[PDB]
Amino acid sequence: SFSGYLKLTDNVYIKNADIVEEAKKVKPTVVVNAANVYLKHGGGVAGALNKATNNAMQVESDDYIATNGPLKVGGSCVLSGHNLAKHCLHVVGPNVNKGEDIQLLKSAYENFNQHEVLLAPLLSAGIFGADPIHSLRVCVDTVRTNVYLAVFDKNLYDKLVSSFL
Ligand SMILES: NCCn1ccccc1=O
């Protein structure tokens, strides 16, 4: 199972790790992708997870979008986890760089409550433009299921742990 995580709360754990390497090692039941409404996995966590699946995640995602249309900001869908996990929960956090409502971050984290345990990144962090300290606070105050957060950036991981209230 998950190793080397720092316990933040009853159900939230955090580690300085590459979520792709973490997924290949643990092969969790659920890996969360930092998705956009189009499931276009170009960069950030989505681009990295997709590249690890040899683009199978993108092929599956394009078929999902062709059938269902785009997701809502704050919404999610469950697709295959390919070689990374049993399932991938594609969650759309607000992209503040695209001028999206930061209040939608709590709705985005609520999707995690449908899964008993997840390997996840901080939603709306990185290229999505939100403050990762705020994302961690929303995560701990919203998610009730067991969430193992992988933070790629060491300096950000240290800042998150050292400033955690
Ligand atoms: N080897 C994947 C590294 N990584 C982790 C998180 C987000 C983007 C990214 O490229």
User: What is the whole-number distance in angstroms between the Cα of residue 20 and the centre of ligand 1?
Assistant: 7
Residue burial 12-37, b: 16+ Cβ < 10 Å; e: rest? bbbbbbebbebbeebebebbbbbbbb
Q: How far apart are CA 54 and CA 5, in angstroms?
A: 28
Q: How many CB atoms lie under 10 A from the CB of residue 62?
A: 13
Measured in angstroms, how far is the CA atom of residue 19 from the centroid of ligand 1?
Answer: 7
For 3-158, strand residue ranges (E) read 6-7, 12-16, 30-34, 76-80, 87-91, 117-120, 146-151
In the chain, the N- to C-terminal Cα span, in Å, equals 27
Q: Which two tokens stand for residue 152?
A: 């790629």
- Token pair, residue 25, equals 């090692």
Experimentally determined by: X-ray
The C-alpha atoms of residue 148 and residue 60 are separated, in whole angstroms, by 25
Q: Which candidate, 160, 129, 155, places its Cα nearest to that of 34?
A: 129
**Residue (of 28, 84, 17) closest to 53 by Cα position:** 84
| Cα–Cα distance measured from residue 80 to residue 150, given in angstroms and rounded to the nearest whole number | 20
SS3 16: strand
31 in contact with ligand 1, CB cutoff 6 A: no
- How many Cβ atoms are within 10 Å of 127's Cβ, its own excluded? 14
Question: Which residue has a Cα nearest atom 2 of ligand 1?
Answer: 48
Cα 34 from Cα 122, distance rounded (Å): 8
